[PDB]
Write an enzyme that holds these catalytic residues in place. Structure first.
Site, PDB file in Angstrom:
ATOM      1  N   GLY A 166      69.170  87.668 -70.740  1.00 34.52           N
ATOM      2  CA  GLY A 166      69.179  86.222 -70.865  1.00 34.52           C
ATOM      3  C   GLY A 166      68.911  85.540 -69.541  1.00 34.52           C
TER       4      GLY A 166
ATOM      5  N   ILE B 280      71.554  71.785 -51.705  1.00 40.28           N
ATOM      6  CA  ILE B 280      71.130  72.973 -52.451  1.00 40.28           C
ATOM      7  C   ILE B 280      69.611  72.986 -52.621  1.00 40.28           C
ATOM      8  CG2 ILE B 280      71.243  74.254 -54.612  1.00 40.28           C
ATOM      9  CD1 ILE B 280      73.981  72.638 -55.076  1.00 40.28           C
TER      10      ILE B 280
ATOM     11  N   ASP C 147      67.224  85.103 -63.571  1.00 41.54           N
ATOM     12  CA  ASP C 147      66.400  83.898 -63.490  1.00 41.54           C
ATOM     13  C   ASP C 147      66.566  83.176 -62.152  1.00 41.54           C
ATOM     14  OD1 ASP C 147      66.434  82.742 -66.984  1.00 41.54           O
ATOM     15  OD2 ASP C 147      65.796  84.641 -66.079  1.00 41.54           O
TER      16      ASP C 147
ATOM     17  N   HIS D 261      68.418  87.745 -54.663  1.00 41.86           N
ATOM     18  CA  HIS D 261      69.541  87.540 -55.588  1.00 41.86           C
ATOM     19  C   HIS D 261      69.228  88.032 -57.002  1.00 41.86           C
ATOM     20  CE1 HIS D 261      72.028  85.513 -52.764  1.00 41.86           C
ATOM     21  NE2 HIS D 261      71.283  84.422 -52.681  1.00 41.86           N
TER      22      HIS D 261
ATOM     23  N   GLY E 113      67.750  67.534 -50.413  1.00 45.01           N
ATOM     24  CA  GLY E 113      68.677  68.054 -49.414  1.00 45.01           C
ATOM     25  C   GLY E 113      69.763  68.904 -50.057  1.00 45.01           C
TER      26      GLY E 113
ATOM     27  N   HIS F 104      64.129  84.865 -50.692  1.00 42.87           N
ATOM     28  CA  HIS F 104      65.580  84.816 -50.730  1.00 42.87           C
ATOM     29  C   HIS F 104      66.119  84.862 -52.160  1.00 42.87           C
ATOM     30  CE1 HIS F 104      69.581  83.631 -49.127  1.00 42.87           C
ATOM     31  NE2 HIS F 104      69.675  82.982 -50.276  1.00 42.87           N
ATOM     32  N   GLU F 105      65.593  84.016 -53.044  1.00 43.83           N
ATOM     33  CA  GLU F 105      66.104  83.962 -54.424  1.00 43.83           C
ATOM     34  C   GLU F 105      65.842  85.250 -55.223  1.00 43.83           C
ATOM     35  OE1 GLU F 105      68.049  80.593 -53.528  1.00 43.83           O
ATOM     36  OE2 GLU F 105      68.299  81.887 -55.269  1.00 43.83           O
TER      37      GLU F 105
ATOM     38  N   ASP G 123      54.524  69.335 -56.572  1.00 43.35           N
ATOM     39  CA  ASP G 123      54.426  69.274 -55.114  1.00 43.35           C
ATOM     40  C   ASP G 123      53.244  70.065 -54.582  1.00 43.35           C
ATOM     41  OD1 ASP G 123      56.827  67.958 -55.328  1.00 43.35           O
ATOM     42  OD2 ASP G 123      58.009  69.596 -54.419  1.00 43.35           O
TER      43      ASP G 123
ATOM     44  N   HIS H 145      68.648  78.506 -56.580  1.00 41.83           N
ATOM     45  CA  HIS H 145      69.646  79.525 -56.854  1.00 41.83           C
ATOM     46  C   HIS H 145      69.113  80.496 -57.886  1.00 41.83           C
ATOM     47  CE1 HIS H 145      71.411  76.296 -59.731  1.00 41.83           C
ATOM     48  NE2 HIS H 145      70.653  77.109 -60.444  1.00 41.83           N
TER      49      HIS H 145
ATOM     50  N   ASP I  16      65.066  73.592 -56.985  1.00 46.58           N
ATOM     51  CA  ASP I  16      65.437  72.187 -57.159  1.00 46.58           C
ATOM     52  C   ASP I  16      64.176  71.329 -56.946  1.00 46.58           C
ATOM     53  OD1 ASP I  16      67.926  70.014 -55.525  1.00 46.58           O
ATOM     54  OD2 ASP I  16      66.462  69.610 -57.110  1.00 46.58           O
ATOM     55  N   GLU I  17      63.708  70.685 -58.013  1.00 48.54           N
ATOM     56  CA  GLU I  17      62.488  69.884 -57.943  1.00 48.54           C
ATOM     57  C   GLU I  17      62.666  68.688 -57.026  1.00 48.54           C
ATOM     58  OE1 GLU I  17      59.128  70.645 -59.576  1.00 48.54           O
ATOM     59  OE2 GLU I  17      59.079  69.520 -57.702  1.00 48.54           O
TER      60      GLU I  17
ATOM     61  N   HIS J 126      74.676  87.822 -49.873  1.00 42.73           N
ATOM     62  CA  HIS J 126      74.256  87.305 -48.582  1.00 42.73           C
ATOM     63  C   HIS J 126      74.493  88.261 -47.428  1.00 42.73           C
ATOM     64  CE1 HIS J 126      74.230  82.877 -50.050  1.00 42.73           C
ATOM     65  NE2 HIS J 126      73.037  83.432 -50.149  1.00 42.73           N
TER      66      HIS J 126
HETATM   67  N1  LIG Z   1      75.623  72.945 -50.315  1.00 43.88           N
HETATM   68  C1  LIG Z   1      74.880  74.231 -50.199  1.00 43.88           C
HETATM   69  O1  LIG Z   1      73.831  74.302 -49.462  1.00 43.88           O
HETATM   70  C2  LIG Z   1      75.346  75.389 -50.918  1.00 43.88           C
HETATM   71  C3  LIG Z   1      76.483  76.055 -50.125  1.00 43.88           C
HETATM   72  C4  LIG Z   1      76.627  77.414 -50.224  1.00 43.88           C
HETATM   73  C5  LIG Z   1      77.669  77.841 -51.311  1.00 43.88           C
HETATM   74  O2  LIG Z   1      78.892  77.720 -51.105  1.00 43.88           O
HETATM   75  O3  LIG Z   1      77.195  78.275 -52.470  1.00 43.88           O
HETATM   76  N2  LIG Z   1      74.186  76.316 -51.202  1.00 43.88           N
HETATM   77  C6  LIG Z   1      73.895  76.711 -52.521  1.00 43.88           C
HETATM   78  O4  LIG Z   1      74.590  76.309 -53.489  1.00 43.88           O
HETATM   79  C7  LIG Z   1      72.756  77.631 -52.763  1.00 43.88           C
HETATM   80  C8  LIG Z   1      73.203  78.933 -53.351  1.00 43.88           C
HETATM   81  C9  LIG Z   1      72.092  79.775 -53.881  1.00 43.88           C
HETATM   82  C10 LIG Z   1      71.592  80.822 -52.855  1.00 43.88           C
HETATM   83  O5  LIG Z   1      72.458  81.153 -52.072  1.00 43.88           O
HETATM   84  O6  LIG Z   1      70.473  81.194 -52.883  1.00 43.88           O
HETATM   85  N3  LIG Z   1      72.021  78.067 -51.602  1.00 43.88           N
HETATM   86  C11 LIG Z   1      70.843  77.366 -51.246  1.00 43.88           C
HETATM   87  O7  LIG Z   1      70.425  76.396 -51.905  1.00 43.88           O
HETATM   88  C12 LIG Z   1      70.021  77.865 -50.024  1.00 43.88           C
HETATM   89  C13 LIG Z   1      69.184  79.052 -50.496  1.00 43.88           C
HETATM   90  C14 LIG Z   1      68.316  79.671 -49.412  1.00 43.88           C
HETATM   91  C15 LIG Z   1      68.923  80.465 -48.466  1.00 43.88           C
HETATM   92  C16 LIG Z   1      68.158  81.045 -47.466  1.00 43.88           C
HETATM   93  C17 LIG Z   1      66.799  80.790 -47.454  1.00 43.88           C
HETATM   94  C18 LIG Z   1      65.901  81.385 -46.356  1.00 43.88           C
HETATM   95  C19 LIG Z   1      66.256  82.145 -45.248  1.00 43.88           C
HETATM   96  C20 LIG Z   1      65.135  82.479 -44.449  1.00 43.88           C
HETATM   97  C21 LIG Z   1      65.239  83.298 -43.217  1.00 43.88           C
HETATM   98  C22 LIG Z   1      64.135  83.980 -42.747  1.00 43.88           C
HETATM   99  C23 LIG Z   1      64.240  84.739 -41.596  1.00 43.88           C
HETATM  100  C24 LIG Z   1      65.464  84.799 -40.927  1.00 43.88           C
HETATM  101  C25 LIG Z   1      66.554  84.122 -41.402  1.00 43.88           C
HETATM  102  C26 LIG Z   1      66.452  83.364 -42.557  1.00 43.88           C
HETATM  103  C27 LIG Z   1      63.921  81.968 -44.900  1.00 43.88           C
HETATM  104  S1  LIG Z   1      64.259  81.101 -46.315  1.00 43.88           S
HETATM  105  C28 LIG Z   1      66.190  79.968 -48.413  1.00 43.88           C
HETATM  106  C29 LIG Z   1      66.947  79.395 -49.387  1.00 43.88           C
HETATM  107 CA   LIG Z   2      68.884  69.689 -53.373  1.00 44.96          CA
HETATM  108 CA   LIG Z   3      59.501  68.060 -55.645  1.00 45.82          CA
HETATM  109 CA   LIG Z   4      66.336  86.691 -67.399  1.00 42.71          CA
HETATM  110 ZN   LIG Z   5      70.040  76.645 -62.409  1.00 45.05          ZN
HETATM  111 ZN   LIG Z   6      71.465  82.861 -51.330  1.00 47.45          ZN
END
Ligand SMILES: NC(=O)[C@H](CCC(=O)O)NC(=O)[C@H](CCC(=O)O)NC(=O)CCc1ccc(-c2cc(-c3ccccc3)cs2)cc1
Ligand SMILES: [Ca+2]
Ligand SMILES: [Ca+2]
Ligand SMILES: [Ca+2]
Ligand SMILES: [Zn+2]
Ligand SMILES: [Zn+2]
Length: 159
Positions: free
Chosen positions: A86, A76, A90, A118, A74, A114-115, A20, A79, A94-95, A124
């Site tokens: 291990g 997720i 990491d 974690h 769209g 954000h990642e 991308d 993560h 998502d590509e 969160h």
């Molecule tokens: N269907 C889903 O979307 C599920 C639901 C959540 C769950 O139950 O796990 N999401 C998921 O499975 C995963 C989990 C991994 C993670 O949390 O990082 N989450 C995700 O895929 C979303 C991960 C994400 C979260 C937040 C951000 C950002 C926040 C901001 C920002 C800046 C300023 C102010 C406020 C905000 C800029 S960027 C970017 C990416």
């Molecule tokens: Ca996705």
């Molecule tokens: Ca892509």
């Molecule tokens: Ca590692």
């Molecule tokens: Zn993974």
């Molecule tokens: Zn998160």
């Protein structure tokens, strides 16, 4: 509470690159995201190009080898695993999302901030202004700053 790196010097490696964005723009986004956390902690981050790294950065799609399959465009976005050996630490992206240097698609820099949070052991935030708030939203990347809550969270883990 969860785990933490029981050391302050932390390496990362980019396993592979999204088509991308150009390679240089990927490296930069990731570098700047690490720098955000570096700026408010004693942590020092170093990129390696081969070898064992603490935090492996991966782009992949669908089911990609862990218990947490991606779900196509769209939903997720990415993560990351908490501190540990291990797969610990990491960060997976998502590509099937369209990664960008700006407000188009999904911004890689903001997502990496954000990642990595974690990867460093943060959970969160309930604060909508905190980068660790659970959902993506674009904010001006030139003016981006961690919220006081983000800084409190990370400093509670590393001093
Ligand atoms: N269907 C889903 O979307 C599920 C639901 C959540 C769950 O139950 O796990 N999401 C998921 O499975 C995963 C989990 C991994 C993670 O949390 O990082 N989450 C995700 O895929 C979303 C991960 C994400 C979260 C937040 C951000 C950002 C926040 C901001 C920002 C800046 C300023 C102010 C406020 C905000 C800029 S960027 C970017 C990416
Ligand atoms: Ca996705
Ligand atoms: Ca892509
Ligand atoms: Ca590692
Ligand atoms: Zn993974
Ligand atoms: Zn998160």
């Amino acid at each position: 509470m969860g785990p933490v790196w029981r050391k302050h010097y932390i390496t990362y490696r980019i396993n592979n690159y999204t088509p991308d964005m150009n390679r240089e723009d990927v490296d930069y986004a990731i570098r700047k995201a690490f720098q955000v956390w570096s700026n408010v902690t004693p942590l020092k981050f170093s990129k390696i190009n081969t070898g064992m790294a603490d935090i492996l950065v991966v782009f992949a799609r669908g089911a990609h080898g862990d218990d947490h399959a991606f779900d196509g465009k769209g939903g997720i976005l990415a993560h990351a695993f908490g501190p540990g050996s291990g797969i610990g630490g990491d960060a997976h992206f998502d590509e099937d999302e369209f990664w960008t240097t700006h407000s188009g698609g999904t911004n890689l820099f903001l997502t990496a901030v954000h990642e990595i949070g974690h990867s460093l052991g943060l959970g969160h935030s309930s604060d909508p202004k905190a980068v660790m708030f659970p959902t993506y939203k674009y904010v001006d990347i030139n003016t981006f700053r961690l919220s006081a809550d983000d800084i409190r969270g990370i400093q509670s883990l590393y001093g």
